[PDB]
Amino acid sequence: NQALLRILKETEFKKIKVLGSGAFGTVYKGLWIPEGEKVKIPVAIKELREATSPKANKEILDEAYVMASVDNPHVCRLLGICLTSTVQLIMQLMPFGCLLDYVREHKDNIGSQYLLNWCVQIAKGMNYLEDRRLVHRDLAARNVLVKTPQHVKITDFGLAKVPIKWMALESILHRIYTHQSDVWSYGVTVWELMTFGSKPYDGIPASEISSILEKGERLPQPPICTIDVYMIMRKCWMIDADSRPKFRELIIEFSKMARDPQRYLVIQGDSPTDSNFYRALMDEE
Amino acid sequence: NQALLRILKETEFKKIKVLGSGAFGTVYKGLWIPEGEKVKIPVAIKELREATSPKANKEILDEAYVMASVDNPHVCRLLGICLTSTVQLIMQLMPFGCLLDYVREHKDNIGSQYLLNWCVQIAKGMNYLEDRRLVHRDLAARNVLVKTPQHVKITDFGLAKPIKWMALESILHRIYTHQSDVWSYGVTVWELMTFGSKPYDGIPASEISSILEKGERLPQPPICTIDVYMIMRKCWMIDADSRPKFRELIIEFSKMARDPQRYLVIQGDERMHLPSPTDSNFYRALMDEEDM
Ligand SMILES: */C=C\C(=O)Nc1cc(Nc2nccc(-c3c[nH]c4ccccc34)n2)c(OC)cc1N(C)CCN(C)C
Ligand SMILES: */C=C\C(=O)Nc1cc(Nc2nccc(-c3c[nH]c4ccccc34)n2)c(OC)cc1N(C)CCN(C)C
């Protein structure tokens, strides 16, 4: 339990290069130097934006034990924390980056097998989070990290210290966050993957998204998506939260589609060797 | 089978720094650059010193498929191969280096639990090779790599195509069996417990078979109780069938590893210790996710 979160000193790790930023702070590639050893181990470090208070630290640290306890192949685990003026969180470095940048850079030479399997894995990770009674609140393609092209993982859930175009209507109007609002964001996340990282509702300011949603408008059908896949997305954006699919169902339906991917995605152009190769070098779990 | 060995292009990996040299060539720290991606993945690359023909390459490929097939937490697997004028072999990079160098450089901070656990793991890897009917032929502390200080893996077997680590029958008649590997295992354990001392330091290699036939053996390491040295001595019996099996060495060093200060007497053993579960989880999540 308590063996899952390592407390680090300033002196045993260094930030070397900035990787990104989130609403919580900046993400760095760092190097961990085990005390008394001579190696330097790549890590990712999340520096919280504000210098935090001892009441926040006690809430942060005890919540860090929960984040350090998530045990699922498609959810990133927190590994360590360092409490300086600003709090630093240490997790595994994913050299491929987020799925959003990955799908933009491979814009039309990703096949249906990868796209559908990513949807299965994200649904698997979210369902686990639901099983642990954890609401993500910010599911998006930028918050799915690529461990290998064949293996993606959810990150950056937790902490209560806005992404309007991913949020369920009830989150926009009332700031209600449930697993069923995570389902809405999952639907948006699936659409991002199917459009290869297009910006949702391009041309509409965030301040007007709830008006168009109340009027019944939704993200359009991606060109490569059959109506089978689109109906699942549209069901994720129902106004009634309880009519939306559950993540456990999304696992099943998308697993079914992944067995005949060319039937459910019309992508123009549709080995153990390379999977075993990737697993040996990057992905032994 | 043929799916465990990736055939690489020259243009998808780069040698960046020389790590050391061996009998079959030079080993580099390198970078693997997957086609069409932007990432650079650290690897180890071994370039063969001598330049081989296409028919030599076919036999090399036949063994590279065997080397790519080893699936064990304590044996290094060949991952890929590139067929240049000199053949390049690609495997996982072990940032901690080889155990011989590690034990020399960290000798004043290595406690009994580490030494005994290394012995267990090397025997496990050798027992796997024996189960695969693969004779190592060159087991030594230099050919055991440190993935982490808690996890070592045997390397650089599968060569065929080091007098002071060899069984007598290997020196005299070039007989290599799993039981001659056991003798080399005994010498490797002696290397660890002496923190990387050179065996028979100052004795010319050509005269080693003489002293072995006359019954001389490596001395009891200062930190070893007689229990540990008796095992080493049983590894160096002239009758190969009388030496212990790797299966038995897993068991005996495991028993000792459950009470490590009873079997190794190290000055300072109490102020050193293995990592807490916290430090083990942290290590594995960052560097070592395999089963073990
Ligand atoms: C889409 C943004 C992105 O993630 N980019 C990115 C990511 C990583 N690796 C990584 N590893 C562990 C955690 C995280 C992480 C967690 N939360 C966030 C929030 C924002 C960004 C990253 C986050 N990321 C990279 O590793 C090298 C690189 C990378 N990029 C694309 C950096 C920019 N290039 C041009 C150098
Ligand atoms: C004792 C020699 C040694 O292995 N040194 C070493 C090794 C690695 N990593 C590594 N990874 C995969 C394969 C090999 C390997 C296989 N055969 C050989 C033969 C010679 C050298 C290496 C070989 N090695 C290192 O990773 C950074 C470093 C390293 N060194 C140079 C340790 C010396 N320093 C710590 C002073």
Side-chain angles (χ1 to χ4, degrees), chain A residues 161-187:
Chain A
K161 275 94 216 299
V162 280
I164 288 292
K165 290 177 174 175
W166 282 256
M167 288 160 56
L169 182 60
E170 71 267 16
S171 309
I172 299 173
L173 298 177
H174 305 293
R175 295 198 164 262
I176 293 175
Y177 292 96
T178 67
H179 306 119
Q180 288 315 99
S181 61
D182 282 348
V183 169
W184 181 300
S185 305
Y186 174 89

PDB file of all heavy atoms in Angstrom, chain A residues 161-187:
ATOM      1  N   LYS A 161      -7.518  20.969  -7.546  1.00  0.00           N
ATOM      2  CA  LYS A 161      -7.008  22.291  -7.183  1.00  0.00           C
ATOM      3  C   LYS A 161      -7.292  23.330  -8.255  1.00  0.00           C
ATOM      4  O   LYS A 161      -8.045  23.064  -9.188  1.00  0.00           O
ATOM      5  CB  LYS A 161      -5.517  22.212  -6.899  1.00  0.00           C
ATOM      6  CG  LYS A 161      -5.200  21.805  -5.472  1.00  0.00           C
ATOM      7  CD  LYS A 161      -5.011  20.261  -5.476  1.00  0.00           C
ATOM      8  CE  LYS A 161      -5.537  19.535  -4.216  1.00  0.00           C
ATOM      9  NZ  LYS A 161      -4.915  19.902  -2.876  1.00  0.00           N
ATOM     10  N   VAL A 162     -10.759  25.570 -18.747  1.00  0.00           N
ATOM     11  CA  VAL A 162     -11.348  24.233 -18.677  1.00  0.00           C
ATOM     12  C   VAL A 162     -11.573  23.644 -20.083  1.00  0.00           C
ATOM     13  O   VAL A 162     -11.833  24.375 -21.035  1.00  0.00           O
ATOM     14  CB  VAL A 162     -12.675  24.244 -17.889  1.00  0.00           C
ATOM     15  CG1 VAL A 162     -12.418  24.252 -16.378  1.00  0.00           C
ATOM     16  CG2 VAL A 162     -13.522  25.422 -18.318  1.00  0.00           C
ATOM     17  N   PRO A 163     -11.485  22.325 -20.226  1.00  0.00           N
ATOM     18  CA  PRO A 163     -11.607  21.764 -21.587  1.00  0.00           C
ATOM     19  C   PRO A 163     -13.059  21.682 -22.046  1.00  0.00           C
ATOM     20  O   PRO A 163     -13.672  20.602 -22.095  1.00  0.00           O
ATOM     21  CB  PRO A 163     -10.973  20.382 -21.427  1.00  0.00           C
ATOM     22  CG  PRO A 163     -11.316  19.984 -20.020  1.00  0.00           C
ATOM     23  CD  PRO A 163     -11.332  21.268 -19.210  1.00  0.00           C
ATOM     24  N   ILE A 164     -13.649  22.842 -22.357  1.00  0.00           N
ATOM     25  CA  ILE A 164     -15.091  22.911 -22.631  1.00  0.00           C
ATOM     26  C   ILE A 164     -15.525  21.911 -23.716  1.00  0.00           C
ATOM     27  O   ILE A 164     -16.526  21.206 -23.560  1.00  0.00           O
ATOM     28  CB  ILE A 164     -15.490  24.353 -23.004  1.00  0.00           C
ATOM     29  CG1 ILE A 164     -15.458  25.268 -21.769  1.00  0.00           C
ATOM     30  CG2 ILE A 164     -16.835  24.372 -23.707  1.00  0.00           C
ATOM     31  CD1 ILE A 164     -16.522  24.980 -20.721  1.00  0.00           C
ATOM     32  N   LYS A 165     -14.753  21.779 -24.795  1.00  0.00           N
ATOM     33  CA  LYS A 165     -15.179  20.983 -25.948  1.00  0.00           C
ATOM     34  C   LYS A 165     -15.103  19.482 -25.746  1.00  0.00           C
ATOM     35  O   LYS A 165     -15.480  18.738 -26.659  1.00  0.00           O
ATOM     36  CB  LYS A 165     -14.368  21.369 -27.177  1.00  0.00           C
ATOM     37  CG  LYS A 165     -14.755  22.754 -27.616  1.00  0.00           C
ATOM     38  CD  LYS A 165     -13.967  23.243 -28.760  1.00  0.00           C
ATOM     39  CE  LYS A 165     -14.535  24.537 -29.198  1.00  0.00           C
ATOM     40  NZ  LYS A 165     -13.717  25.125 -30.271  1.00  0.00           N
ATOM     41  N   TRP A 166     -14.620  19.026 -24.596  1.00  0.00           N
ATOM     42  CA  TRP A 166     -14.612  17.621 -24.241  1.00  0.00           C
ATOM     43  C   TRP A 166     -15.628  17.286 -23.162  1.00  0.00           C
ATOM     44  O   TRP A 166     -15.896  16.107 -22.922  1.00  0.00           O
ATOM     45  CB  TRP A 166     -13.205  17.225 -23.758  1.00  0.00           C
ATOM     46  CG  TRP A 166     -12.184  17.022 -24.883  1.00  0.00           C
ATOM     47  CD1 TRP A 166     -11.722  15.827 -25.360  1.00  0.00           C
ATOM     48  CD2 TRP A 166     -11.503  18.049 -25.648  1.00  0.00           C
ATOM     49  NE1 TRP A 166     -10.816  16.046 -26.384  1.00  0.00           N
ATOM     50  CE2 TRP A 166     -10.667  17.394 -26.575  1.00  0.00           C
ATOM     51  CE3 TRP A 166     -11.540  19.445 -25.649  1.00  0.00           C
ATOM     52  CZ2 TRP A 166      -9.877  18.085 -27.488  1.00  0.00           C
ATOM     53  CZ3 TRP A 166     -10.753  20.135 -26.572  1.00  0.00           C
ATOM     54  CH2 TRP A 166      -9.924  19.450 -27.468  1.00  0.00           C
ATOM     55  N   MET A 167     -16.235  18.285 -22.545  1.00  0.00           N
ATOM     56  CA  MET A 167     -17.013  18.071 -21.342  1.00  0.00           C
ATOM     57  C   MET A 167     -18.451  17.737 -21.685  1.00  0.00           C
ATOM     58  O   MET A 167     -19.006  18.245 -22.663  1.00  0.00           O
ATOM     59  CB  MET A 167     -16.961  19.319 -20.469  1.00  0.00           C
ATOM     60  CG  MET A 167     -15.623  19.502 -19.838  1.00  0.00           C
ATOM     61  SD  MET A 167     -15.345  21.178 -19.288  1.00  0.00           S
ATOM     62  CE  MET A 167     -16.728  21.460 -18.195  1.00  0.00           C
ATOM     63  N   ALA A 168     -19.037  16.858 -20.883  1.00  0.00           N
ATOM     64  CA  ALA A 168     -20.460  16.614 -20.981  1.00  0.00           C
ATOM     65  C   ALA A 168     -21.195  17.893 -20.641  1.00  0.00           C
ATOM     66  O   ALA A 168     -20.703  18.721 -19.867  1.00  0.00           O
ATOM     67  CB  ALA A 168     -20.887  15.501 -20.028  1.00  0.00           C
ATOM     68  N   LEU A 169     -22.405  18.027 -21.200  1.00  0.00           N
ATOM     69  CA  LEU A 169     -23.189  19.239 -20.999  1.00  0.00           C
ATOM     70  C   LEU A 169     -23.372  19.534 -19.515  1.00  0.00           C
ATOM     71  O   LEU A 169     -23.185  20.679 -19.083  1.00  0.00           O
ATOM     72  CB  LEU A 169     -24.547  19.106 -21.703  1.00  0.00           C
ATOM     73  CG  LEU A 169     -25.544  20.258 -21.680  1.00  0.00           C
ATOM     74  CD1 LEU A 169     -24.996  21.525 -22.321  1.00  0.00           C
ATOM     75  CD2 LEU A 169     -26.885  19.845 -22.315  1.00  0.00           C
ATOM     76  N   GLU A 170     -23.652  18.498 -18.703  1.00  0.00           N
ATOM     77  CA  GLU A 170     -23.897  18.749 -17.283  1.00  0.00           C
ATOM     78  C   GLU A 170     -22.637  19.270 -16.600  1.00  0.00           C
ATOM     79  O   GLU A 170     -22.729  20.017 -15.623  1.00  0.00           O
ATOM     80  CB  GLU A 170     -24.420  17.491 -16.562  1.00  0.00           C
ATOM     81  CG  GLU A 170     -23.410  16.350 -16.356  1.00  0.00           C
ATOM     82  CD  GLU A 170     -23.449  15.334 -17.474  1.00  0.00           C
ATOM     83  OE1 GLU A 170     -24.025  15.669 -18.533  1.00  0.00           O
ATOM     84  OE2 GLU A 170     -22.930  14.204 -17.297  1.00  0.00           O
ATOM     85  N   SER A 171     -21.466  18.940 -17.123  1.00  0.00           N
ATOM     86  CA  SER A 171     -20.237  19.483 -16.546  1.00  0.00           C
ATOM     87  C   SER A 171     -20.091  20.959 -16.883  1.00  0.00           C
ATOM     88  O   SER A 171     -19.589  21.744 -16.071  1.00  0.00           O
ATOM     89  CB  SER A 171     -19.020  18.692 -17.041  1.00  0.00           C
ATOM     90  OG  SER A 171     -19.209  17.300 -16.853  1.00  0.00           O
ATOM     91  N   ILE A 172     -20.476  21.343 -18.101  1.00  0.00           N
ATOM     92  CA  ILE A 172     -20.415  22.745 -18.494  1.00  0.00           C
ATOM     93  C   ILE A 172     -21.387  23.584 -17.691  1.00  0.00           C
ATOM     94  O   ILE A 172     -21.048  24.674 -17.227  1.00  0.00           O
ATOM     95  CB  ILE A 172     -20.668  22.868 -19.998  1.00  0.00           C
ATOM     96  CG1 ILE A 172     -19.594  22.095 -20.749  1.00  0.00           C
ATOM     97  CG2 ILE A 172     -20.706  24.327 -20.431  1.00  0.00           C
ATOM     98  CD1 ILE A 172     -19.866  22.015 -22.246  1.00  0.00           C
ATOM     99  N   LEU A 173     -22.608  23.100 -17.511  1.00  0.00           N
ATOM    100  CA  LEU A 173     -23.666  23.913 -16.908  1.00  0.00           C
ATOM    101  C   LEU A 173     -23.609  23.918 -15.384  1.00  0.00           C
ATOM    102  O   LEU A 173     -23.938  24.927 -14.750  1.00  0.00           O
ATOM    103  CB  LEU A 173     -25.013  23.381 -17.364  1.00  0.00           C
ATOM    104  CG  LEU A 173     -25.289  23.420 -18.871  1.00  0.00           C
ATOM    105  CD1 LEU A 173     -26.650  22.793 -19.157  1.00  0.00           C
ATOM    106  CD2 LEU A 173     -25.268  24.853 -19.350  1.00  0.00           C
ATOM    107  N   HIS A 174     -23.234  22.785 -14.782  1.00  0.00           N
ATOM    108  CA  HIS A 174     -23.366  22.560 -13.348  1.00  0.00           C
ATOM    109  C   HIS A 174     -22.107  22.014 -12.694  1.00  0.00           C
ATOM    110  O   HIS A 174     -22.087  21.833 -11.474  1.00  0.00           O
ATOM    111  CB  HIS A 174     -24.520  21.596 -13.091  1.00  0.00           C
ATOM    112  CG  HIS A 174     -25.808  22.052 -13.690  1.00  0.00           C
ATOM    113  ND1 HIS A 174     -26.483  23.165 -13.241  1.00  0.00           N
ATOM    114  CD2 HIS A 174     -26.512  21.583 -14.745  1.00  0.00           C
ATOM    115  CE1 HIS A 174     -27.579  23.331 -13.959  1.00  0.00           C
ATOM    116  NE2 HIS A 174     -27.619  22.386 -14.880  1.00  0.00           N
ATOM    117  N   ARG A 175     -21.053  21.772 -13.459  1.00  0.00           N
ATOM    118  CA  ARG A 175     -19.817  21.209 -12.926  1.00  0.00           C
ATOM    119  C   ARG A 175     -20.049  19.876 -12.226  1.00  0.00           C
ATOM    120  O   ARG A 175     -19.414  19.565 -11.217  1.00  0.00           O
ATOM    121  CB  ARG A 175     -19.143  22.203 -12.006  1.00  0.00           C
ATOM    122  CG  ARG A 175     -18.734  23.378 -12.832  1.00  0.00           C
ATOM    123  CD  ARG A 175     -17.685  24.190 -12.119  1.00  0.00           C
ATOM    124  NE  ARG A 175     -16.992  25.103 -13.026  1.00  0.00           N
ATOM    125  CZ  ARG A 175     -15.808  24.867 -13.595  1.00  0.00           C
ATOM    126  NH1 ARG A 175     -15.202  23.686 -13.448  1.00  0.00           N
ATOM    127  NH2 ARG A 175     -15.278  25.786 -14.401  1.00  0.00           N
ATOM    128  N   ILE A 176     -20.945  19.069 -12.785  1.00  0.00           N
ATOM    129  CA  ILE A 176     -21.145  17.702 -12.335  1.00  0.00           C
ATOM    130  C   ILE A 176     -20.134  16.832 -13.069  1.00  0.00           C
ATOM    131  O   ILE A 176     -20.035  16.871 -14.306  1.00  0.00           O
ATOM    132  CB  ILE A 176     -22.584  17.239 -12.591  1.00  0.00           C
ATOM    133  CG1 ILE A 176     -23.532  18.034 -11.688  1.00  0.00           C
ATOM    134  CG2 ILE A 176     -22.698  15.746 -12.345  1.00  0.00           C
ATOM    135  CD1 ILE A 176     -25.016  17.755 -11.935  1.00  0.00           C
ATOM    136  N   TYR A 177     -19.325  16.110 -12.299  1.00  0.00           N
ATOM    137  CA  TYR A 177     -18.369  15.160 -12.839  1.00  0.00           C
ATOM    138  C   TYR A 177     -18.679  13.790 -12.276  1.00  0.00           C
ATOM    139  O   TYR A 177     -18.664  13.596 -11.055  1.00  0.00           O
ATOM    140  CB  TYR A 177     -16.940  15.578 -12.515  1.00  0.00           C
ATOM    141  CG  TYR A 177     -16.515  16.832 -13.230  1.00  0.00           C
ATOM    142  CD1 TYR A 177     -16.591  18.061 -12.604  1.00  0.00           C
ATOM    143  CD2 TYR A 177     -16.025  16.779 -14.534  1.00  0.00           C
ATOM    144  CE1 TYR A 177     -16.208  19.213 -13.244  1.00  0.00           C
ATOM    145  CE2 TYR A 177     -15.636  17.924 -15.188  1.00  0.00           C
ATOM    146  CZ  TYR A 177     -15.732  19.136 -14.528  1.00  0.00           C
ATOM    147  OH  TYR A 177     -15.357  20.293 -15.160  1.00  0.00           O
ATOM    148  N   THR A 178     -18.978  12.853 -13.169  1.00  0.00           N
ATOM    149  CA  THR A 178     -19.295  11.478 -12.818  1.00  0.00           C
ATOM    150  C   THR A 178     -18.541  10.586 -13.786  1.00  0.00           C
ATOM    151  O   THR A 178     -17.862  11.059 -14.702  1.00  0.00           O
ATOM    152  CB  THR A 178     -20.791  11.170 -12.914  1.00  0.00           C
ATOM    153  OG1 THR A 178     -21.187  11.238 -14.289  1.00  0.00           O
ATOM    154  CG2 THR A 178     -21.614  12.152 -12.103  1.00  0.00           C
ATOM    155  N   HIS A 179     -18.667   9.282 -13.588  1.00  0.00           N
ATOM    156  CA  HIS A 179     -18.107   8.382 -14.577  1.00  0.00           C
ATOM    157  C   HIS A 179     -18.836   8.539 -15.901  1.00  0.00           C
ATOM    158  O   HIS A 179     -18.252   8.313 -16.972  1.00  0.00           O
ATOM    159  CB  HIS A 179     -18.172   6.938 -14.066  1.00  0.00           C
ATOM    160  CG  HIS A 179     -17.548   6.755 -12.720  1.00  0.00           C
ATOM    161  ND1 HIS A 179     -18.259   6.309 -11.623  1.00  0.00           N
ATOM    162  CD2 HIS A 179     -16.299   7.032 -12.271  1.00  0.00           C
ATOM    163  CE1 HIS A 179     -17.458   6.265 -10.571  1.00  0.00           C
ATOM    164  NE2 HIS A 179     -16.265   6.702 -10.936  1.00  0.00           N
ATOM    165  N   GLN A 180     -20.100   8.948 -15.848  1.00  0.00           N
ATOM    166  CA  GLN A 180     -20.877   9.110 -17.076  1.00  0.00           C
ATOM    167  C   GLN A 180     -20.507  10.380 -17.825  1.00  0.00           C
ATOM    168  O   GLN A 180     -20.681  10.429 -19.046  1.00  0.00           O
ATOM    169  CB  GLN A 180     -22.369   9.051 -16.770  1.00  0.00           C
ATOM    170  CG  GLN A 180     -22.830   7.643 -16.411  1.00  0.00           C
ATOM    171  CD  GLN A 180     -22.277   6.568 -17.358  1.00  0.00           C
ATOM    172  OE1 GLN A 180     -21.295   5.897 -17.038  1.00  0.00           O
ATOM    173  NE2 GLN A 180     -22.928   6.387 -18.511  1.00  0.00           N
ATOM    174  N   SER A 181     -20.010  11.412 -17.133  1.00  0.00           N
ATOM    175  CA  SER A 181     -19.394  12.518 -17.863  1.00  0.00           C
ATOM    176  C   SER A 181     -18.028  12.122 -18.416  1.00  0.00           C
ATOM    177  O   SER A 181     -17.638  12.602 -19.484  1.00  0.00           O
ATOM    178  CB  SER A 181     -19.305  13.781 -16.998  1.00  0.00           C
ATOM    179  OG  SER A 181     -18.529  13.613 -15.829  1.00  0.00           O
ATOM    180  N   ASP A 182     -17.302  11.218 -17.749  1.00  0.00           N
ATOM    181  CA  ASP A 182     -16.085  10.692 -18.364  1.00  0.00           C
ATOM    182  C   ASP A 182     -16.415   9.988 -19.682  1.00  0.00           C
ATOM    183  O   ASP A 182     -15.653  10.067 -20.654  1.00  0.00           O
ATOM    184  CB  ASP A 182     -15.374   9.730 -17.396  1.00  0.00           C
ATOM    185  CG  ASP A 182     -14.580  10.442 -16.285  1.00  0.00           C
ATOM    186  OD1 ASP A 182     -14.369  11.675 -16.354  1.00  0.00           O
ATOM    187  OD2 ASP A 182     -14.164   9.747 -15.328  1.00  0.00           O
ATOM    188  N   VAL A 183     -17.564   9.307 -19.737  1.00  0.00           N
ATOM    189  CA  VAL A 183     -17.994   8.629 -20.964  1.00  0.00           C
ATOM    190  C   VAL A 183     -18.177   9.627 -22.105  1.00  0.00           C
ATOM    191  O   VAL A 183     -17.752   9.373 -23.239  1.00  0.00           O
ATOM    192  CB  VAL A 183     -19.271   7.812 -20.701  1.00  0.00           C
ATOM    193  CG1 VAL A 183     -19.886   7.332 -21.990  1.00  0.00           C
ATOM    194  CG2 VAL A 183     -18.928   6.627 -19.807  1.00  0.00           C
ATOM    195  N   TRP A 184     -18.767  10.795 -21.819  1.00  0.00           N
ATOM    196  CA  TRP A 184     -18.884  11.824 -22.852  1.00  0.00           C
ATOM    197  C   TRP A 184     -17.506  12.179 -23.400  1.00  0.00           C
ATOM    198  O   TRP A 184     -17.289  12.172 -24.618  1.00  0.00           O
ATOM    199  CB  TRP A 184     -19.587  13.066 -22.295  1.00  0.00           C
ATOM    200  CG  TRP A 184     -19.791  14.204 -23.302  1.00  0.00           C
ATOM    201  CD1 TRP A 184     -18.818  14.888 -24.004  1.00  0.00           C
ATOM    202  CD2 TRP A 184     -21.049  14.788 -23.698  1.00  0.00           C
ATOM    203  NE1 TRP A 184     -19.404  15.851 -24.791  1.00  0.00           N
ATOM    204  CE2 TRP A 184     -20.765  15.805 -24.627  1.00  0.00           C
ATOM    205  CE3 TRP A 184     -22.380  14.560 -23.335  1.00  0.00           C
ATOM    206  CZ2 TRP A 184     -21.756  16.586 -25.197  1.00  0.00           C
ATOM    207  CZ3 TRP A 184     -23.378  15.332 -23.923  1.00  0.00           C
ATOM    208  CH2 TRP A 184     -23.056  16.331 -24.837  1.00  0.00           C
ATOM    209  N   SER A 185     -16.556  12.456 -22.508  1.00  0.00           N
ATOM    210  CA  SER A 185     -15.187  12.782 -22.929  1.00  0.00           C
ATOM    211  C   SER A 185     -14.518  11.628 -23.672  1.00  0.00           C
ATOM    212  O   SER A 185     -13.767  11.847 -24.637  1.00  0.00           O
ATOM    213  CB  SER A 185     -14.362  13.183 -21.714  1.00  0.00           C
ATOM    214  OG  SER A 185     -15.022  14.251 -21.043  1.00  0.00           O
ATOM    215  N   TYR A 186     -14.795  10.391 -23.254  1.00  0.00           N
ATOM    216  CA  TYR A 186     -14.307   9.242 -23.999  1.00  0.00           C
ATOM    217  C   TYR A 186     -14.816   9.279 -25.431  1.00  0.00           C
ATOM    218  O   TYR A 186     -14.061   9.015 -26.375  1.00  0.00           O
ATOM    219  CB  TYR A 186     -14.753   7.955 -23.305  1.00  0.00           C
ATOM    220  CG  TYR A 186     -14.401   6.717 -24.090  1.00  0.00           C
ATOM    221  CD1 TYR A 186     -13.166   6.092 -23.908  1.00  0.00           C
ATOM    222  CD2 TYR A 186     -15.284   6.188 -25.044  1.00  0.00           C
ATOM    223  CE1 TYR A 186     -12.815   4.961 -24.635  1.00  0.00           C
ATOM    224  CE2 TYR A 186     -14.935   5.062 -25.784  1.00  0.00           C
ATOM    225  CZ  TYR A 186     -13.700   4.458 -25.563  1.00  0.00           C
ATOM    226  OH  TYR A 186     -13.359   3.357 -26.285  1.00  0.00           O
ATOM    227  N   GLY A 187     -16.103   9.596 -25.608  1.00  0.00           N
ATOM    228  CA  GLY A 187     -16.650   9.718 -26.951  1.00  0.00           C
ATOM    229  C   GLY A 187     -15.933  10.771 -27.773  1.00  0.00           C
ATOM    230  O   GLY A 187     -15.593  10.532 -28.939  1.00  0.00           O
TER     231      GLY A 187
END
